[PDB]
Amino acid sequence: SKVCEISGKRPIVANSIQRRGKAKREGGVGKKTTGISKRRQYPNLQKVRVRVAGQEITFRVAASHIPKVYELVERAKGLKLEGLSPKEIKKELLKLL
Amino acid sequence: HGKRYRALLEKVDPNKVYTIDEAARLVKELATAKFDETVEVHAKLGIDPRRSDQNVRGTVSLPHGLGKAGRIEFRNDKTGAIHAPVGKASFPPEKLADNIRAFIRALEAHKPEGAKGTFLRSVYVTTTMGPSVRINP
Amino acid sequence: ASEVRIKLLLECTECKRRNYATEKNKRNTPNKLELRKYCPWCRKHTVHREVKI
RNA sequence: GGGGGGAACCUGGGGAACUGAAACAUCUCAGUACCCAGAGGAGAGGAAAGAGAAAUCGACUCCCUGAGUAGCGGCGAGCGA
RNA sequence: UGGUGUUGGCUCUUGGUCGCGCCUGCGUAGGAUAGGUGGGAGCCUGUGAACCCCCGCCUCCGGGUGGGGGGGAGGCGCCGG
RNA sequence: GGGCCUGACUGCGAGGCCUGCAAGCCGAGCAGGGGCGAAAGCCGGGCCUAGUGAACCGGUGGUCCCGUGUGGAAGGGCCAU
RNA sequence: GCCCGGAUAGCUCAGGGUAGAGCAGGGGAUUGAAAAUCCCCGUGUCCUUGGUUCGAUUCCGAGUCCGGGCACCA
Ligand SMILES: [Mg+2]
Ligand SMILES: [Mg+2]
Ligand SMILES: [Mg+2]
Ligand SMILES: [Mg+2]
Ligand SMILES: [Mg+2]
Ligand SMILES: [Mg+2]
Ligand SMILES: [Mg+2]
Ligand SMILES: [Mg+2]
Ligand SMILES: [Mg+2]
Ligand SMILES: [Mg+2]
Ligand SMILES: [Mg+2]
Ligand SMILES: [Mg+2]
Ligand SMILES: [Mg+2]
Ligand SMILES: [Mg+2]
Ligand SMILES: [Mg+2]
Ligand SMILES: [Mg+2]
Ligand SMILES: [Mg+2]
Ligand SMILES: [Mg+2]
Ligand SMILES: [Mg+2]
Ligand SMILES: [Mg+2]
Ligand SMILES: [Mg+2]
Ligand SMILES: [Mg+2]
Ligand SMILES: [Mg+2]
Ligand SMILES: [Mg+2]
Ligand SMILES: [Mg+2]
Ligand SMILES: [Mg+2]
Ligand SMILES: [Mg+2]
Ligand SMILES: [Mg+2]
Ligand SMILES: [Mg+2]
Ligand SMILES: [Mg+2]
Ligand SMILES: [Mg+2]
Ligand SMILES: [Mg+2]
Ligand SMILES: [Mg+2]
Ligand SMILES: [Mg+2]
Ligand SMILES: [Mg+2]
Ligand SMILES: [Mg+2]
Ligand SMILES: [Mg+2]
Ligand SMILES: [Mg+2]
Ligand SMILES: [Mg+2]
Ligand SMILES: [Mg+2]
Ligand SMILES: [Mg+2]
Ligand SMILES: [Mg+2]
Ligand SMILES: [Mg+2]
Ligand SMILES: [Mg+2]
Ligand SMILES: [Mg+2]
Ligand SMILES: [Mg+2]
Ligand SMILES: [Zn+2]
């Protein structure tokens, strides 16, 4: 997985921290880190398929921004899109962000 | 239930909570039996029944009350309930709320020191043969 | 000390403050220790009682 | 219009180990080395949803001080506003 | 591998737990199918009692309960073994 | 062997033994409040020399010392364990 | 450390009105024997103490001990 086409969100780097011990809050000696290592956290990208000017357009967008796709289509209403390829329509739509 | 009771039922509505005063004005409207009904005040202490130490028991010397003077003894039953006579259906309304309130006061005065819950989980006013109304203690 | 010879505090019966620590054999001596001890809080002798450490 | 180059410098995306802790794993080395993208004669930052106790100050950057202070820390080695 | 996102429509059967409605609660002495205490001498009847006809039915096997068809003025408690 | 008892004290401590450090050890005397004794007096465990574990981290009972603008609260300090 | 728990006769065991059940032991029937079967019988503060109820192994508090569970250990 890779880059939200609407929000721009991308994989980030996060540590995966391993602990042991009873937290001080719980009356323990405190926590010890038994290991820390890099990992990636991904955006929740999914396929949204959508039909604009009869043609079929398809986005890789993070779940959080699925609604945002459809908002693009509503704002696509008064647009002179007819007769276009899907490639340039997508371009057209993306331009309202 | 008998027509006589079915009647009264209309002048109630469970949902509504009512007020010490609002309930005092109903009592009269709810005492349709051939005699000076009483009134009673049923609570529902939010304490543990099967126990002791946290047992609600005592007396209250109602300013007016009874008319049958005061000092009524009340003691929570095996369940979480406590009941007591607050006066007779006669009594001008502004005379009952004085006792209802004076009795409920004693209850709080006899709450334990180790009791979980809102204590007065619920309270109601009634009459010997009439229905009942919840109330904001 | 052992599981039987145990540690224990002595608490002042009048201010509830522990002022002493000592030990006992709990077989030999199942009952809670009572003893007079100077409580420095109260500034006078007081009967102290065994309290769990 | 872009593409490609430029000793160092700059920013951004990624990012070690020896080593130190007189062993070592958290910690350190160090966000360093290095790779990558971009910039430019600089770059970055910048006109408060800020500071923080002054009833205060007034964008940002850079130097000196504050201070090895405040703190952080297998409360160790150390790190450090 | 649980939870949750992407992830929707219909249905069947279901429990938990919240409010109210009601019924079930039988050691023995006993008119006999007593939930804990409190209140309380009248309540149940032209908003139809006494048994009777189809019965949701539970059952500890006697009965407990509940709607109605028939039905036209008496059943149930203080009383007290 | 008996009688009473809880000094198996709280606040300190002159002066020493030991000794690289850190520890370890002995201690007269004064104050508080006690015990026993008619009293002188003795009593800060046990004839004596083994029966033990620095720190860090944290627990529990006090204390009411600090509390991040202020009042509280969180959390920490301090005494005891 | 905290949470769930069992204790009932010689062994093992189920249980607001109560005190029993399996086989161990003993007596009797039977047998060639060992059994199996069959009939009777014991073997109790129901861990301890304190408290409800008219009273209780039964509800509750407190203890003591083994059983189990989870976690932590400077
Ligand atoms: Mg993780
Ligand atoms: Mg740590
Ligand atoms: Mg969402
Ligand atoms: Mg000591
Ligand atoms: Mg001793
Ligand atoms: Mg002091
Ligand atoms: Mg270039
Ligand atoms: Mg370039
Ligand atoms: Mg960077
Ligand atoms: Mg870099
Ligand atoms: Mg690597
Ligand atoms: Mg390393
Ligand atoms: Mg290494
Ligand atoms: Mg090393
Ligand atoms: Mg080394
Ligand atoms: Mg090595
Ligand atoms: Mg670093
Ligand atoms: Mg310049
Ligand atoms: Mg510039
Ligand atoms: Mg800029
Ligand atoms: Mg502006
Ligand atoms: Mg330190
Ligand atoms: Mg450091
Ligand atoms: Mg650093
Ligand atoms: Mg600086
Ligand atoms: Mg997974
Ligand atoms: Mg989750
Ligand atoms: Mg799913
Ligand atoms: Mg002697
Ligand atoms: Mg003393
Ligand atoms: Mg000295
Ligand atoms: Mg020395
Ligand atoms: Mg003295
Ligand atoms: Mg003396
Ligand atoms: Mg004397
Ligand atoms: Mg003297
Ligand atoms: Mg001395
Ligand atoms: Mg350390
Ligand atoms: Mg500490
Ligand atoms: Mg404290
Ligand atoms: Mg504050
Ligand atoms: Mg303060
Ligand atoms: Mg203060
Ligand atoms: Mg603050
Ligand atoms: Mg305030
Ligand atoms: Mg505090
Ligand atoms: Zn004291």
mmCIF file with all atom_site columns, C-alpha atoms (C1' of nucleotides) in Angstrom, chain B residues 2-3 6 33-35 38 40 68 77-79 83 85 129, chain E residues 20 22 35-47:
data_model
loop_
_atom_site.group_PDB
_atom_site.id
_atom_site.type_symbol
_atom_site.label_atom_id
_atom_site.label_alt_id
_atom_site.label_comp_id
_atom_site.label_asym_id
_atom_site.label_entity_id
_atom_site.label_seq_id
_atom_site.pdbx_PDB_ins_code
_atom_site.Cartn_x
_atom_site.Cartn_y
_atom_site.Cartn_z
_atom_site.occupancy
_atom_site.B_iso_or_equiv
_atom_site.pdbx_formal_charge
_atom_site.auth_seq_id
_atom_site.auth_comp_id
_atom_site.auth_asym_id
_atom_site.auth_atom_id
_atom_site.pdbx_PDB_model_num
ATOM 1  C CA    . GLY B 1 2   ? -62.717 -2.695  39.948 1.00 0.00 ? 2   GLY B CA    1
ATOM 2  C CA    . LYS B 1 3   ? -64.343 0.079   37.946 1.00 0.00 ? 3   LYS B CA    1
ATOM 3  C CA    . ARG B 1 6   ? -59.866 1.713   36.980 1.00 0.00 ? 6   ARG B CA    1
ATOM 4  C CA    . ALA B 1 33  ? -63.115 4.665   49.317 1.00 0.00 ? 33  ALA B CA    1
ATOM 5  C CA    . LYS B 1 34  ? -65.892 4.887   51.913 1.00 0.00 ? 34  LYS B CA    1
ATOM 6  C CA    . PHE B 1 35  ? -63.657 6.110   54.756 1.00 0.00 ? 35  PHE B CA    1
ATOM 7  C CA    . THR B 1 38  ? -54.525 7.053   54.880 1.00 0.00 ? 38  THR B CA    1
ATOM 8  C CA    . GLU B 1 40  ? -48.624 5.993   53.098 1.00 0.00 ? 40  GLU B CA    1
ATOM 9  C CA    . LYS B 1 68  ? -56.178 8.588   64.198 1.00 0.00 ? 68  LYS B CA    1
ATOM 10 C CA    . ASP B 1 77  ? -38.263 -4.793  55.531 1.00 0.00 ? 77  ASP B CA    1
ATOM 11 C CA    . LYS B 1 78  ? -36.213 -7.806  54.456 1.00 0.00 ? 78  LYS B CA    1
ATOM 12 C CA    . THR B 1 79  ? -36.316 -6.349  50.955 1.00 0.00 ? 79  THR B CA    1
ATOM 13 C CA    . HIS B 1 83  ? -43.138 2.065   54.502 1.00 0.00 ? 83  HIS B CA    1
ATOM 14 C CA    . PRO B 1 85  ? -48.359 6.265   57.414 1.00 0.00 ? 85  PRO B CA    1
ATOM 15 C CA    . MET B 1 129 ? -57.047 1.728   48.230 1.00 0.00 ? 129 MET B CA    1
ATOM 16 C "C1'" . C   E 2 20  ? -43.434 -1.506  32.572 1.00 0.00 ? 20  C   E "C1'" 1
ATOM 17 C "C1'" . C   E 2 22  ? -48.688 -9.844  34.973 1.00 0.00 ? 22  C   E "C1'" 1
ATOM 18 C "C1'" . G   E 2 35  ? -42.465 -15.188 48.481 1.00 0.00 ? 35  G   E "C1'" 1
ATOM 19 C "C1'" . G   E 2 36  ? -39.892 -10.651 52.889 1.00 0.00 ? 36  G   E "C1'" 1
ATOM 20 C "C1'" . U   E 2 37  ? -41.959 -6.924  55.817 1.00 0.00 ? 37  U   E "C1'" 1
ATOM 21 C "C1'" . G   E 2 38  ? -45.467 -2.905  56.102 1.00 0.00 ? 38  G   E "C1'" 1
ATOM 22 C "C1'" . G   E 2 39  ? -50.087 -0.876  55.502 1.00 0.00 ? 39  G   E "C1'" 1
ATOM 23 C "C1'" . G   E 2 40  ? -54.950 -1.910  56.278 1.00 0.00 ? 40  G   E "C1'" 1
ATOM 24 C "C1'" . A   E 2 41  ? -62.190 -3.227  58.367 1.00 0.00 ? 41  A   E "C1'" 1
ATOM 25 C "C1'" . G   E 2 42  ? -63.705 -3.068  54.248 1.00 0.00 ? 42  G   E "C1'" 1
ATOM 26 C "C1'" . C   E 2 43  ? -62.751 -4.434  49.470 1.00 0.00 ? 43  C   E "C1'" 1
ATOM 27 C "C1'" . C   E 2 44  ? -64.481 -7.553  44.750 1.00 0.00 ? 44  C   E "C1'" 1
ATOM 28 C "C1'" . U   E 2 45  ? -70.805 -6.446  41.783 1.00 0.00 ? 45  U   E "C1'" 1
ATOM 29 C "C1'" . G   E 2 46  ? -75.207 -3.476  36.230 1.00 0.00 ? 46  G   E "C1'" 1
ATOM 30 C "C1'" . U   E 2 47  ? -67.106 -1.628  34.009 1.00 0.00 ? 47  U   E "C1'" 1
#
